[PDB]
Every structure is written in C-alpha cells, then in structure tokens.
Write a protein that binds this DNA or RNA. Sequence first.
DNA 1: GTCAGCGCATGG
DNA 2: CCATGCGCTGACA
Length: 1752
Amino acid sequence: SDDLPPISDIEAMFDHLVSRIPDIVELVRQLNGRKLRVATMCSGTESPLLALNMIAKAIKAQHGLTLAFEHVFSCEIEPFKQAYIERNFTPPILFRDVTELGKKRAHTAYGSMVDVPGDVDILIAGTSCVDGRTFRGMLQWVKKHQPPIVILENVCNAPWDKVVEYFGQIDYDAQYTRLDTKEFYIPHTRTRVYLFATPSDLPEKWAQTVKDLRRPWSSPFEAFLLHTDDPNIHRARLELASARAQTSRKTTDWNRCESRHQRARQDEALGLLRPLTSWQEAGVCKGLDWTWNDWLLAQTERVVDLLEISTLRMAKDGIDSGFKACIWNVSQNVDRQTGSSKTALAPCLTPNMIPWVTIRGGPVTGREALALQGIPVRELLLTSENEDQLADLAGNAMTTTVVGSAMIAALKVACHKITEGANPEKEAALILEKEAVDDEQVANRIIGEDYLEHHDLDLAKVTKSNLSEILDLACRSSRHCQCEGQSGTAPNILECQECSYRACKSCGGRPEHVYAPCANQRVEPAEFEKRFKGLLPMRVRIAGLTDQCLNAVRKAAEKSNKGSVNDNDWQLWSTALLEGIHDAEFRFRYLKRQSTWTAVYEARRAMLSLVLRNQIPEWRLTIKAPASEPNNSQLRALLLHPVARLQIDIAGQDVLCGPWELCIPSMKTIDIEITGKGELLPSWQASLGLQGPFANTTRWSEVEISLQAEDENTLDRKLSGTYQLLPRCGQAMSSLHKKRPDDGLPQLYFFLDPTRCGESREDRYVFSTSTERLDYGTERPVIARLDSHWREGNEKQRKVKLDVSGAWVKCPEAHLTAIRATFAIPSSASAISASLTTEGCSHAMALLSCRVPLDPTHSESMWRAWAEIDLSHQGNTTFANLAWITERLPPLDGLKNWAHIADDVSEHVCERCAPRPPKIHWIKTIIAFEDKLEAGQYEHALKHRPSPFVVQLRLDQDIGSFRIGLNIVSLAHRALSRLPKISLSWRLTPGHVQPRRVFILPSNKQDPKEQLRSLWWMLEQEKATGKTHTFVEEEISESLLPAVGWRAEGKAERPVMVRGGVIADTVISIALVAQTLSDLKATLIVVPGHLSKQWPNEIARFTGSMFKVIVIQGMKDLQEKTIAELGKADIIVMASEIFESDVYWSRLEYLSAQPLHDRFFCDRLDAAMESLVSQTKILVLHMFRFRRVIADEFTYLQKKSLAAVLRLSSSYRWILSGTPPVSDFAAIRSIATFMGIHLGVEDDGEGDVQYQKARAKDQTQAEKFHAFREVHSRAWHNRRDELAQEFLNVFVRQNIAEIPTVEHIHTFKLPASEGAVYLELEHHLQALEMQARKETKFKNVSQGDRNARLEEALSDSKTAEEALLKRCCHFTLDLSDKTQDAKSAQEACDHITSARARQLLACQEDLSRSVNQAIALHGWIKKKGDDERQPFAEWIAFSSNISKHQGDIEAARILLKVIEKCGVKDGNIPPSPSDKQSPAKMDDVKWQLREQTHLLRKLVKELVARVRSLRFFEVVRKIQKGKSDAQIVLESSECGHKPSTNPDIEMAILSCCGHVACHKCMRKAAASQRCVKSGECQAAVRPTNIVKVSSLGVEGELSSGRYGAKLEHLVNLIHSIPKNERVLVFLQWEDLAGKVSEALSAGRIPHVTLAKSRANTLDRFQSARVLLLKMNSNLTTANHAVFLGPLFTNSLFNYRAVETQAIGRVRRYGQQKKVHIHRLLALDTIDMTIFNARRTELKEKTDWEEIPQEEY
DNA sequence: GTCAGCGCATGG
DNA sequence: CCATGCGCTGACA
Ligand SMILES: [Zn+2]
Ligand SMILES: [Zn+2]
Ligand SMILES: [Zn+2]
Ligand SMILES: [Zn+2]
Ligand SMILES: [Zn+2]
C-alpha cells in the first residue's frame, strides 16, 4: 500500500523481514555453528544464494549470531548462463547437466567429471526442473541421497499435482501454493508456484507461515530503474544506432491480428490515427524527439500499432503516456492487455517480452529487468550478453525476496530435521585461524612503497577564474539533444525560438517548434568537467544557523506579508532542518549534464546540489526524510522540496559567496481569475483524433490572469499578464503557455506538471521558470501551483484557487565554508622496473598511497590494519565513495611508456598467472571433449589465479590512508603465455573513456617501366640486406580499473625475420625466379586449374630454353615422377584441386604411416606433418621443402587446399593475387599465417555475429562457456588492428592505374508522360505491399491463384526496385511480352490505364466469388444448427453500412455493389447465387467460416489500394494534359483555395489518396495526418506524400520519339563523340539489352552484341562502333564505358567489386587516349537514390580513389 | 532453425 | 466474475 514506510533497498527488505520472525535465533543452535549445505539447480540467477546471504547479514545485524552456508554445487545448462553464474556467484562445482546426477560421477562445466557430493541440507530447484527427463534426474538424485527439504518453482500453469504423485514414489510429503512477487516488497506483479516436500502435516505448516510473511509493495517501480542518462543505458542505446548503420524492410503479414486492432479502435471508440509513432506501409516511423527512434524502426508494424492503441486508450482517461511512468508489455495480443493496473506497478516481464518504459521512450534494458527481480545491479558483471539472452535470463529468473520468504519459513518450520556437527569450539578455532592467516597474507600482499615520492599535499583548493566566463562555457558545453547523453556530440543543432528547446536535424522533427539553427560554438564536455572540478571545493559545510536565528527569520517573515507557519509544522520542519545541518560534512559525489550541469554534494542526512543554470545559478539544499517514515506523513511531505537556496554572485570570482534564503512552510491559498481570449483551437484529445465525446471540441488560445494588489505585493515574482499558448511546442498535455512581457528576470511559463506516480487527478497546473525534462528524484522550481480540478476549456472565466506555499525568506546568519593531506606517486618510471624481480608473481607493486585526514566520529566501516576491498564485488561502490579525494589527484602521466627487462626466457608457462588450457580429442560426424585430468587441473589453476589490481584501505588513529597495488609480473606472464629473445614491457594509461576501420594498402610507387620498378621492392626484400628483424610480433595482456580511469597493459614481443611479400595488381614473378637461382632447389607455383595453362605459354614466350620445366596437372603425375627426375629443375607448377583430391591424402597417409580421412582436418593433418619429416630426414610434395613458393589465387582457396598451402614449407614465401581479402582482420591473419607470422590470437569477439555463428558450430561446449566467461575490450581490438595495418605497410604492395580517366555524369529530367508512368508504377507498388515476389509454393492452389494475381503487377522481374530501374531505362508496361508494343509515349500510358482497369475488375470478381463461398458456408451452419458471436454476420452488417467505412468511400460503394450482386440485403439469405459446395465436423466448419472472413477483409483492403492508385494516375494525367478540362479539377479542390482567384499561388496533389488542394493549406493537413477531406477518405498521410503540380510538368515539354528518354540520350551521346573513338556499353537487364539494341538499330550506328562464340565476337571487336554487353581477352580499343543507370546489389562490397571490374575491363592498359567513363542518370528517380546512397556509403566505408569529373 | 504471429484458460 | 498467465506452431531462410 502506501501507509508503509517506502523501502527500496533489498538488504533493508530482508532486515524488515527477519525482524518479523524471531525464530532463526533458535535455528542457529540446532545447527550449532555447522555450515549449512545448500545445493540449487537450474536457477540461472541464484536467488536462493542471494536471499540466503542477505539473511545471514540481516540476522548478524539483528542478533549478533553468525549463520554460515557451504554452497555444495549448482547446475546450469546453457553456456551464457553458466558463464554468468561462474563469473558472479562462484560455486565450488558447476555441473553441465542434470540427468547424470543419479550416477556416481558427472561432467562439470570445465569437463573435469568430479563426483556428486551427495548429502545436503536443502535443495532449491526451479525454472528447468519440470521439463520429463530433468525431473526424472532430480528425483533420481533425491532418491540417491536424502535431503531433508526440497523446494521447487516453475511457471504456474503446469502439472504440480502430477509432481505431487511423483514425489509420492520417493515417500515425500508434498504441498504447493502460488506466491505473488508484488506482495513481497517488490512493485512488480508476478505469480509463480512453489512446493515443499520432505521425507516421512509439516508442509501444511510451511504453507501457513509463508502465507504469513507477506508485506505489500510501497515504492514505485521507477525507484528501481536506472536513469535514462546513465552510461550503461546510453551504451545500450548506441548499440541500436550502430546496428542500423551497419545494416529491405520486409513486411510481415499480420492480418489476423490487424483484425483485432481494428475491432479495438472501433469498439473502444477511439480515433484511427496514430500519435506517438506515425508509422506507415512501406514507410519509416518518426516518433517524438525523445523516443529511441532506432528502436522504433526495428520493431514490426503490429508492435508499433499496438503502442499506438495503448497510448490512445490511456489518453482517454486524462493520463498522458509519455509523462506518467508506466511499463507496457506489448508481446501479447491487443485485447488481452492490462499493461499496468495501477500505473506505479510493472507487468510480469515474461521471457519473450517487448517492454516500453513510458517515460524514457524505450525498452526496459536487460539490467533493469534484472533489477526488478530483486537482484542488485550496482556491482553486476556482464560480458557481451545479447539483449534477448538477458531477457531470457531475467524472465526465467526467480525473485529474491520471494525465495527468501519461502526459504526462511521452510528452514524454520523444518528446523528439527537437521542434525548437528556440534563442535563450536573447533569451528571457532578453524575460522579464527582462517581470519588470522588471511590478515597476515593481505598485509603482505602489497610490496614496494619504498620508492614512492610522497610529495604533494592538497585539498579544498580552487582556481576561481571568472564566473561570467564559466557560465558562458557551461551554456555551450551542456547537453543539447537527448541523443547526446553525458558525452559525444550531435552536429546540426536546431534551437527553438520561443521556449528555447534544442534538438538535432536527425531527431527533433516531430513536435515542430519554430526551429532555426543555433549559434553555439560547441566545447568538449570533458574540458568543461576539468575546469568545473578544478573550480569546485571538494568538501563544504553549512554553518551559522541556530534555533534563535531560525526563530528570528520566522518572525521576520511574519513581520512582512509572507504566510505564517502552523506551530506543529514549524516544530517538525525546524527540528529536522537543524539536526540535518548540525555538524554534518558535505562531500563531492558526481557532476552530471542534463542541458545544465548539476554538481551534487551528499552528506549523511542532508543533500545539497549546485546547478549551473544559464541565468542565476544556485545551490539548493534538501534534507533526506527519516528512514522509517510512512509515505503519507506530513514530515515526508515537508522535506520533499529544497529548503535553502544560495544564489551566486555573478560579477564576483568565487563560487560560494552569495546570500542564503530559506522557505518556511507557509501554505497560503489565494484566488485568481482565469479568463479566455483569442481564437479557438482544437483540444489535445481532438488532436489525437478520438471520436468519443472528445471529437471536435475546442480550446481557448489566450488566458489572462489578474491578481489583487496585496497578493502581488506578497508574491516574490509577479504572476499577472496574458499567456498565449504554444500548441506546436510539446509539454504535459500540449498545454505550454508563454508570458507576454521585469526584463532581467527569466521568462516563466504556465503549463501542467504531472507527478510521476499519482492518479489522474493529482496533476495540477503549475507556474515555472524551468521547463526541461527531469529525472526521478529532482523537482523543478515552482512559483505557485494551482487547483487540480482546472484544465483547458472552452468556457469564459472561472476563479480557481491558487496556492503558493513556502515563501523564500533571506537570512544573513548562515554561511557556507570550505573544509598534511598528502598523496604519493612513483616518481620515476623504470624505478619500478629496477625494483621488480622475477618469480615475484605473488606481490603487487604499489602505484599510489594517499593520506587525507578524517574523523573517528560517524566515519564509514569501509575503512579499518588493512582490508581486501574485494573489487570484483564491491569496488564499483567503493570508488564512488572516494570521489572527494580521487577527483583531486593528478593523473600520474609519468609512467605512460613501456619499459622492462629483455632477453627473457623464450618459452615459459607460469601455471599460476596463466595455466595451460586443456587438450581436445575427437570421437570419429565429429564430437570433441576435454581430458579429465588436464581439465580438472585447468579448473583448479584457473580458479586460483592472482589479483591484477589490489586496493586496500586503512584507518589507524583517525588518519585515513589507502594504497593501490598493481601486478606487473602477472600481466607479463599472461602476455608470454599467449605467444607460441622475447623482450617484455609494461605501461599504464590514465583516464580512458565506432565504425569498423578501413584497411588500406601501400602503393608500389616512387621506388628505385613499372615492370622494372616493381622488381626493385621484390629482390632487395628477398635478400633482406641487413634487416635483422623484418617484423616484430606482439601480444598484450591487459586489465583495467573502471572507476579510477586506468588501463594497464603488459606486452611480450617476439622479434622475427622473414622474407617475401604480397602483391596485388605473374609476368614479373617468372621474370624474377631466373635470377634467384643464380628438396634441394625447386620453386613451386599453385594455380586453381582454370588458369594453369597460361604460365607455360608465358615462360616459353619470355625465356627461351633457359632451363627445364616440370609442369604437372592432375592426380596421376606423382607416381611417374621420381626424385632425380623431379630435381634440379627450376620451375614447377601445381594445381589446387590436387590438394582436394583424395589420392593426395591416401599417399600422404601411406608415406606418413598414419592409421586421416577427409577444423578436424587441420588437426589430424599436422600430426602426420611431424611424422613425414622424420622419415625424410632419414636419407606428396609436403614431405619436402622448397626455395621459393608462389600462390596465384589465394582468395579462391576453400580451406581444404588452403590448409596444405599453409603447411608446405620453403626458404622464401611469395603471393600473387589480383587483390587479397584484406578487408577483414581474420583474412589478414590468414595471409600472415601463411607468411609465417603469429600476427595475433583469435578471441572470437572481433568477427561480426555472422562469422561468429559460422565458427560456433565447431566450438566445444566448454569453449563456448569460456568465450562468454572471459572477454577483452574494444581498445585491445583496436590495438591489434593497428598492428595488422603496420603489417600491411610492411609487406603488402598494391599496383593501381595511374592512363588518365575522367567521368562525365549526364543528368536530365524525364519528359512528362514517361515520368508520369514511372510515378504511377512506383506509387502503385507502394500502395500494394509487394517489394518482391515470393518463391515458396503455397499449401493450397486456391491461395496460389490469388497470390499470382497479386504478383501480376511485377510483370518484369522480382524486386520492386528492379522493375523501377527498367521503367527508368525504357517505358513499356511489360518488357517480356510482345503481344502489345509501346509504339510511343502517351500510348504506353493508355496501356497502363487498360491493364489497371482489367486487374481491378478481376479483383472485384474474385471478391464476389469469395463472398459467395462464404455465404454457402453460413447457410450450411444456419441450416444444420444465443450468446456467442459469429464474425461473418458482423462483417456483413459492417460492410452493408456505407457510412461506417475506412478507406476510400468509392471502394466502399463498389463493395456494396458486389454484395448486392451476391444478393444479400442487410445480412440474410441462405443460398448463394451460383452456389458452390461447402466442404465434416461442425466446429471445423465454423472455423472455416472464420478464416474465410479474414480472407474477405484482406481482399477488401487490396481493393481499396487499387482504387486509390487508379485515382492518382487519372488525376496526374489530367494535370499533365494542360487543357481547360485539366484545369477544371484544379477548380474543384477540397481546400477552397481555387486557382481562379486573384492570387494564384500554388496547388499540389497527394499520392496516398488522389485529392488536390491548396499547398500551404495542404501542409497543415499533412502535419496532422489527415486527408484534406477526411470525411471522405481515411488516408494515412505523411508530409512526404505531397507533390507540387510544378514538379510533374506539362505535356510536350521534352520530345520523345518511339523510345525511352535514356535510350534517346544514349543515341545522342554516341553521335556526339568523335568517330575514331570506340564505345563500350554496359547493361544490367537483358530485356533492356534487347530494347537498346532496337534503339541503336533505329539509330545510324551499327552495334555488336556478345556461349563459346562470345570470344569470337570479341575477336570481331579486336567493323562496328559499339559493343554492348551485360555488366557483371582484354579489349581496350574502346574508350567510352557508357553505363545505363546504377548497379544495385545486396552489399556495398559487391557493388564496389563489380563496378571496379567493369571499369577495369576498359581502363586496364594500352590507352593512348584518355578513357572516359559515363553514367546516364535521370533526375528525381530511384537511379538517383541508388547512385547517391552508394557513393555516400562507399566513400566512408572504403575511401577508394575518387575518379576526377568534368563537364562535357 | 530462428522467431512473431495468434489464441482462450484458470484459480479465488 | 475478476485478475494474471507467459508458450506452441506454422512461415521463412
Ligand atoms: Zn517553442
Ligand atoms: Zn538527436
Ligand atoms: Zn606468474
Ligand atoms: Zn485522400
Ligand atoms: Zn488552403
């Protein structure tokens, strides 16, 4: 309820629970100090563990008695759940599965197979223990050992009774009840079912006590949600925008549920428009400017529209969702929603949820979902878990307070059944020995501190530069658009003009102000944080208030006309104030930007914050209410708002220097009078369009407030004046007003202020000078609230009560004052290096020792001797309580460059800093395991690993001191263990807080024609003159401290020397190998087989009989060749298919004497590679090495021969390739792996999710577990990519054109009729829902014919944009068929009109036939046999009424005509005209009728779309005709602004409908989502739909003869260029190849079109001028590579490859003229869309060399 | 095989 | 009659 104290901390929940039950104090002694033994299963979140732990702490604080518990083991099945449990809640044993627990041994998560420990006190299973194979396993285990208590839980609707009879087998009692989490302290509504089962009326007693321990919720859910600014929420919001940029719009059909949405929007009598998201068919959705729009774009049309329906259903009441925090779970249907019965609650967050937090405008992130389960998220470790995975983990989790209640009542009622160890003396001796050895070890743990500078002392010092300048910097540093979030910047800010509010261009379109760009030269928020922290004092104290001074103030306010105080209120308020201020120090916590920086100071009972408003900033003081103070107490009411405000002296330089002010609880109510003036406007409900009583009501546009002279004198700031409202500016209920002009004082607004959790009536109109959006736990300045029963209205004037309370009274007596505090850093880098020694892995070495004095009075218990800070569980909350000293410390930039020993051991494993990962086997399919012994040793030496950072705190004799300890040796040893003369390093970086990097290649240019020069970098690199180390390897083993802002690496690098390289343009390699010779000596080359023939020809042509050639090909050439025939021959060839042939592996197995049968292959192969080389060292090409190796098509290899190419050995190693797969780090590592360098190690986080899942069919289960357990950070990945880039600059060379090129882009507007036909086809394919035909074959041909008829509109090809490209290239309704041929323009359009008419008719008869079949069904049911509803009859009743229709009323009339052709009048006739047979059970027949009804509805919608498209086409043709018949339709406009008026401005026609109206008067209708005559059509209009008449053109603007405009312009181009130059034309569509061949034939020039005679046609081309060919042996005589529009493909990469290949056909070589490349483009057309999108994407994502452009 | 449509059931 | 359940199955790749 609310009468309870408000409780929001889990530990306090448990303290208030244990207080209820005083019978665990008696439990501890039957236990007699023995450790409890708890063994849970299948709970992924360990709420048994957490609840029992907090019970231990609560009981210790309540009664001084200590409870223990030895968590015996736990079971979890999926990998990420196992990783989470073993990373947060470390158990002894974590088993993979649950069935094996019957056995004596079972596998563990690491694979060790350690036995099942057996007897336990208590078992808590849930969330998978009823499946039943798993339940059989759990019963088997509970039969094997005897637990005296078992507690289960699962989803409620399940067979719990069946569970009872099953537990009857093992002779166990049983009892089950359902438990409501909303009733155990938590504001979240959920129901689950528990049972208790014990060996042989006890479970009855258990049920009674658990029913007893009930305590309702009393804190709104919003106290559990993290803020919307928070860094974790903002990274979760940037994930969405990043994914959207990395990633067309496939439309799921949802008709059966759209039926329910329509029934709801009609039955609830709410309007049919969509306010929050304005989604659209084949159109994006633009939510408000604060609403996570990249999450609104991803979700489906059903979810989005269901948000729409929920928002309207709430706006009926008066609540305005978007200002009242509530949660909606929109996964379920639309009729079965009670999204939050009480708005302060939260619905059951089911595992497959889609939640929407009403306020922040986005989903409950996974972490907040975990919080509402009771788990604390302050210290939670989460390592790359997806959102869906987190929602599963949280939803199936079980609620800590509920488990605690059930489990403590269980453990009390079943007290007597647990036996006792009963040796408390030995228990005390053991635990005390443990504590003593722990303390000795922790005192020893840090070493060093002898080399430490100990130099500075500082605290409470400032800089006090200039407060005016600081305020100017704040105004430009603060947050601007909601998408910033405490960092980053968003360019193109827009600032409103009245009520200056800001948003970027991207966001911030939707509630339109009068925007205009802002002149705010941005400044980096980190820099302002530096100055602000350097100006604040870090500890302050309020001083100078006594009871007598407070009394003096109260009588001063009484002396003036400021409202007096009731004496009891004065007593409570003054006592709380004085006790809070009295000797309590303020310390700095955090400063946060929310469009105005707030600096927050917290003391132990009062809390005070600095706000840097752009005008009159101040400090405000609010006092925390007492801990146990009921929610409806007058004291808690009084201590809500701040009581003390300290304005700041602007001209002065110091920050804490102003006068104080106090507010006494006056509570004065005066009367105002609100009037009406101005015109009338549509109310908010009517702007949402609700058709209840809220339809066409109105709202006044100017109020005026008058107040008496005495009241205005009493008020601090005057309140009269006339407030116009600002309907386009958005606030509470779109009710923001602005005061007409005192000039210095800030502008104040009269609007509505709703409380975040109250009812719909407690929201009262306010006055304020502050209108921003604010968090939970912050309150706005308020001048005077108004009565809550006043809203905007149409009435004239009322006298409503204005209640101004708490007049601000100024006191002089108060004042705010500030306050060997030394900190130590290591002076010298490399002093550490000298100080450190090997085998000193044990002891960290100090980095900082600070000492700042404290007091022993009321100081924390996080101080103590020393103490483990236990950072992995409490460091995040520790280094928050040390801001007041850490914020002063200089960042210690001295140690920022690596330095350490060298010539370290070339191979080592510490096996305490980095134990050896186990070894992998195979079964035979392939299934891999882990060694029992090796895996057990791995688990042991992994659980016992050293601490990378140590932080400890000490307080001995009221002086505070803490030391920071870092291990160097441990990072170094991890660095070495990563690697396969190794000189180590280490460095530390202070203060560290993105698109995939492009990978460029260094050209072979400006080096000692190109055939000669590119050899220079070849030979000298082959020799490697000098070059002791050509490449220096690396590894980095780095751990970081989150809060303080440090990340310390450790680098182990192996220098290596290697020869070779990679070149990307066979003609120079062969020109090289002859010299290098001037197995023993033999050079190998591997070619796929397509291209092996060219090398013997080329070597014969270049070198004449210089040597021997041993070219081979295919399998049966190894057996002929012997050693002395193969040898002493300079050039050898090979074919990559041979390494794929099984003969090669047969021979290799035989010669290697291995028992192999083609990752698995790459394992067994290298076993044989070790074997062969020993037999060859005694006295298949991979049994022997070479001097050189050259590969030609590295990209082509298919991992099966690629393995062999890696394995083969040689003295030198080269590559030839057209281009390598250098775009990605995995491929870069593959190239380097061939070259022989361990460039990096694979950590399975760097590849995208596609490639990760490509590999993750290989990984062992334990390896998936480890990959989720241990993750490495973004900076690590970036460093490794930088390393790969340096590798590229070293070794890979690339040869590129320049033979100049110049590109001429010819652009033109399409002539009128041709543009008109393109327009119609595009908007038709938009009106219908098909972007592409579907390839699946439907179950029923009665659906097949229908879907074919729908697909008819795509007569050309598959995707819609493809048909659009064909329309651009040449106008014709259908290319494929030659039945009708477009002789000219204005005739193809006639073909369109006829075909559209035919299709529309065919639609009508399909509708009639379906109606007849349905009527036959209805007759069958009626003949063969109250309350229940039969949807077809209501469909008929709805249809036969013309007045209630959505969609064009013309289509509605046509529907009436079709029904009356079927003869039904008002809904009643048994037979159908031309009746068919209606196919045994009556229920199945009813269901058939139902499905038929849905089919009719779908057909109706399709009819509506068809008639609208037809309307649009006839109208646009009318306009383009240009006659008086044309201008008549202009004269008939639903606007009323006719053209035949003295002003003749502009007209425009929509596209969704067809109507036409005043353009200026069209924009309003568009921006409110209403068609110009919405009584006529229900259009779903958006501002992109408007089309101005001047864009279309008029008939006969641009002449067209018999051909498409693009074809004509191509003809003109070829005629224009000179006659000697030859042409090459690229097409994309073969249909278009035919049409353009026709066009060029109709021209004057000849042409040549290009299976095996294609090369002959190329020979012919060497004749005719132009050879046109499809886009996607070298001809270069032609030098004009004309294009026809842009390529489109499914990927930017592939677009780049095809376009550069198409160019490289003609730009290749042998040009004595400058190659032109053209692109014909049509303005405002999808060719422009595709081309510009591809250019803009391609420039950033690849940065290739931009082709120069000129006019021609 | 991954995933969003699509639907009455059930104690208290 | 309220208030709260929380997944199986038939498209699509
Ligand atoms: Zn505004
Ligand atoms: Zn923005
Ligand atoms: Zn070590
Ligand atoms: Zn319309
Ligand atoms: Zn108009």
